[PDB]
A paper describes a structure:
Two of the four scFv molecules (M1 and M2, comprised of chains A + B and C + D, respectively) were well defined by electron density in the CDR regions and could be modeled without chain breaks, whereas parts of CDR H3 could not be traced in the remaining two scFv molecules M3 and M4 (chains E + F and G + H). M1 contained additional electron density corresponding to the trisaccharide ligand. Inspection of the ligand complex revealed that only the sialic acid component ([name]) of the trisaccharide interacts with the antibody, whereas the glucose moiety extends outwards toward the solvent, where it makes contacts with residues of scFv M3 within the same crystallographic asymmetric unit. Most noticeably, Arg98 adopts a new conformation upon ligand binding, where it stacks against the sialic acid residue of the [name] [name] trisaccharide. Wat1 not only interacts with the N-glycolyl hydroxyl group of [name], but also with its 4-OH group, via a second water molecule (Wat2), which binds to the backbone oxygen of Ser96. On the protein side, Wat1 establishes an H-bond with the backbone NH of Trp33 and a weaker, out-of-plane H-bond with the aromatic π face of its indole pyrrole ring. Especially the possible replacement by Phe emphasizes the importance of the aromatic interaction with Wat1. This trisaccharide–water complex, unable to form with NeuAc, places itself like a cassette into the bottom of the binding pocket formed by the backbone and side chains of Ser31, Tyr32, Trp33, Asp52, Pro97, Arg98 and Tyr100D.
[name] is a monoclonal IgG1 with high clinical potential in cancer immunotherapy as it displays extraordinary specificity for [name] [name], while it does not recognize the very similar, ubiquitous NeuAc [name]. Tumor-associated glycolipids such as [name] [name] are auspicious molecular targets in antineoplastic therapies and vaccine strategies.
Numbering used by the authors:
A (entry chain A): 1 to 52, 52A, 53 to 82, 82A, 82B, 82C, 83 to 100, 100A, ...
B (entry chain B): 1 to 106
Write the structure that this text describes.
C-alpha cells in the first residue's frame, strides 16, 4: 500500500523560510514523480512542481520558480519542499502526490494517484 | 495556462441518486482529464484518470466521459462516503491546472 506521510503543521514568520517533507513507503520511490500542490481556504488546487527522484530533475510552475525548491533524498525515501520569503499569501495546505504510471514512454497522465495527508502552514506576524 | 471551470459549484443530492457534474477546459486537452475526491478531513484520492479510466480500488459506480473541452463525472447509487468535493484537472500541458471544485452535499 502506497503511503505519503507529510510533516506536521508549521507556524512560520513573515519573510522567513521553511522546509516540509514527504515520506514515501510501500513503493519504489525512484520510479515515479512527486508533485507538490497548494490549496487555499475553500479554493482549488495550485500545482507547484514535481521532482524526479531518479534523476533529481525538477519542473516548476512559473508562479513558484522563486518561491519553492524541490529536493528528494533517494536513500531515505523522502521528498522535501523549501519555501522562502514567506507571506500571508503562503498560508495554505500543501500536498505531495505521486505521479501515476505513465500511459507510454514519454506520455504521462499527470494524474496524481496517491496523496499525502497535507501540511498546513500559517504565516503570522 | 489552461483554465478549468466546474459546474455547478455545489450539488445537493440524496442517497441512491444518480449524479453528474461538469468540467470545462479552456482548450482541447485531448482526454487528459483527471478527477479527484476530497473529504472534509483533507484527504484526497484519485478517482478517474484519462477521462474514463478507474483508479485502483475506486467503486465502479464512478464513471467519466467527455472529449475536447467538455467532460463529466457520473456517480450512480450515491453512497454516504461520496459526500465530498470533486475536482477535475487537465494533464495535457504544463502546468497542471485544477477546477474550483464541486461540493456534493446531502
Ligand atoms: O517514466 C517514469 C518517470 O517517473 N516512470 C515510469 C517507471 C520507470 O520508468 C521505471 O520504473 C524505472 O525503473 O516505469 C513505469 O512502468 C514500468 C512497468 O510497466 C514495468 C512492468 O510492470 O516495466 C518497466 O520496464 C522495465 C521492463 O519491464 C524490463 O524488462 C526492463 O529490463 O527494465 C524496464 C525498466 O523499468 C516499466 O518501466 C512504472 O514503474 O509504473 C511507468 C512510470 O511512468
Amino acid at each position: 500500500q502506497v503511503q505519503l506521510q507529510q510533516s506536521g503543521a508549521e507556524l512560520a514568520k513573515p519573510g522567513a523560510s521553511m522546509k516540509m517533507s514527504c515520506r514515501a513507503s510501500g513503493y519504489s520511490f525512484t520510479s515515479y514523480w512527486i508533485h507538490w500542490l497548494k490549496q487555499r481556504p475553500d479554493q482549488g488546487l495550485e500545482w507547484i512542481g514535481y521532482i524526479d527522484p531518479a534523476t533529481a530533475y525538477t519542473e516548476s510552475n512559473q508562479k513558484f520558480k522563486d518561491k519553492a525548491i524541490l529536493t528528494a533524498d533517494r536513500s531515505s525515501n523522502t521528498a522535501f519542499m523549501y519555501l522562502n520569503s514567506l507571506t500571508s499569501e503562503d498560508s495554505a495546505v500543501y500536498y505531495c502526490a505521486r505521479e501515476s504510471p505513465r500511459l507510454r514512454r514519454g506520455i504521462y497522465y499527470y494524474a496524481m494517484d496517491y496523496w499525502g495527508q497535507g501540511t498546513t502552514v500559517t504565516v503570522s506576524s
